[PDB]
């Protein structure tokens, strides 16, 4: 067993064009500053990243040791400085792996290059799978039993600002706006024609309603928005078993697609007038209850 | 963009990676709020924080695109180039 494991590492060193000469480091690179920058916080404060401090200290130790050995000091101090440089690089690459992790202002440990990647709050499971998006509103849900199964009610403010670009297209097309900045001005000021165009644009626009804990596939669906008054989003009363969206004051998120291809997919596969069937055991889900 | 492969690297590889080095162990000036030489956040080694501009006085004009300043050693490049340039310490 001790033979084979060692022998697989040796096997990894057999064919690979690598060289373990680099397995012991004569240098250390540094990340660019914009990925670990400092900022001028109010009151003369400078909020700095911890990796900045770690690089600062290791550079300090490097300079001190190089200047000490520039003249040939006795070997005990030189060896102590060498081991301190080794320990500083060890803390840099992983502060918590070996020894007491190096702290900063408070007692909390700093963060190394092998902590900004791993873990839940690193990069993988925090920034690449799910990226917070534009054109993504949210508001409170209220039941309305005056809707077709493919319908939802949306307040006029979220509708004004979400569909603001399509609204602007139509005001410019209708020649109400002589220029685009005038279109901005009438969007901000608000007119009767603005709400008329908003009621016009909400038509033929599937809208992806969504809830937070998407436990199953039938948790995000499409609807057709109708410009209801008030300040709450309005929902059909037999899709509240798919979303599990009951009215204890809950809140619902709403998204919008941008590509017409996305619109076709959302009106074909997503639209809740076709997805009557649950995906688990076949039975219909959107039925009277 | 068909395959992703990894391995190890040496000093030749890192100097291929990087642009310069760093020896001054501290950040930019706290008096004039300006960068320094051979330190962290240095415009010589990392990208210039101010775009179409350099460190001293000579290439602040807009008609300079990507050229190198004669004294502060800063290529007049993007602010986002401060996100890509890299350096190293040599122990």
């Amino acid at each position: 067993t001790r033979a084979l494991k060692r022998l697989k590492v040796v096997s990894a060193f057999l064919q690979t064009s690598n060289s373990p000469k680099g397995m012991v480091l004569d240098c250390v690179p540094v990340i660019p500053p914009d990925l670990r920058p400092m900022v001028q916080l109010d009151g003369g404060r400078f909020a700095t990243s911890d990796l900045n401090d770690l690089y600062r200290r290791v550079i300090n130790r490097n300079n001190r040791l190089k200047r000490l050995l520039d003249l040939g000091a006795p070997e005990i101090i030189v060896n102590n400085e060498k081991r301190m440089l080794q320990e500083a690089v060890d803390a840099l690459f992983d502060n918590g792996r070996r020894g007491r992790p190096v702290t900063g202002p408070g007692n909390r440990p700093l963060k190394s290059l092998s902590d900004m990647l791993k873990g839940k709050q690193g990069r993988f499971r925090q920034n690449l799978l799910g990226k917070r998006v534009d054109y993504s509103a949210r508001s409170v849900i209220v039941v309305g039993p005056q809707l077709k199964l493919h319908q939802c009610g949306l307040p006029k403010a979220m509708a004004l600002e979400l569909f603001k670009p399509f609204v602007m297209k139509r005001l410019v097309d209708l020649n109400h706006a002589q220029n685009i900045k005038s279109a901005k001005r009438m969007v901000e000021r608000g007119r009767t024609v603005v709400y008329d165009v908003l009621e016009e644009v909400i038509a033929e626009h599937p809208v992806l309603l969504n809830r937070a804990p998407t436990l199953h596939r039938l948790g995000i669906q499409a609807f057709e928005p109708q410009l209801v008054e008030g300040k709450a989003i309005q929902i059909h009363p037999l899709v509240c078993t798919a979303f599990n969206a009951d009215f204890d004051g809950d809140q619902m998120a709403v998204h919008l697609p941008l590509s017409a291809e996305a619109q076709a997919e959302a009106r074909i596969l997503m639209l809740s007038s076709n997805n009557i069937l649950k995906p688990a055991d076949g039975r219909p889900v959107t039925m009277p209850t | 963009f068909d395959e992703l492969r990894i391995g190890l690297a040496t000093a030749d590889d890192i100097r291929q990676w990087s642009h310069g080095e760093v020896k001054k162990p501290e950040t930019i000036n706290y008096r004039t709020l300006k960068p320094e030489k051979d330190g962290l956040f240095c415009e010589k080694i990392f990208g210039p924080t101010r775009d179409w501009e350099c460190y001293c006085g000579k290439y602040k004009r807009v008609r300079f695109k990507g050229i190198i300043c004669e004294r502060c050693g800063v290529e007049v490049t993007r602010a986002k180039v401060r996100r890509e340039r890299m350096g190293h310490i040599e122990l």
Partner: peptide
């Protein structure tokens, strides 16, 4: 003491640096 406490604006705060810094690029 004179290196740090003189203009001691250098604070290594991670919890109030990534959310508190706006982006110039629109």
């Amino acid at each position: 003491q004179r290196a740090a406490m003189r203009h001691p604006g250098s604070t290594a705060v991670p919890s109030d640096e990534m959310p508190e810094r706006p982006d110039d690029s629109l």
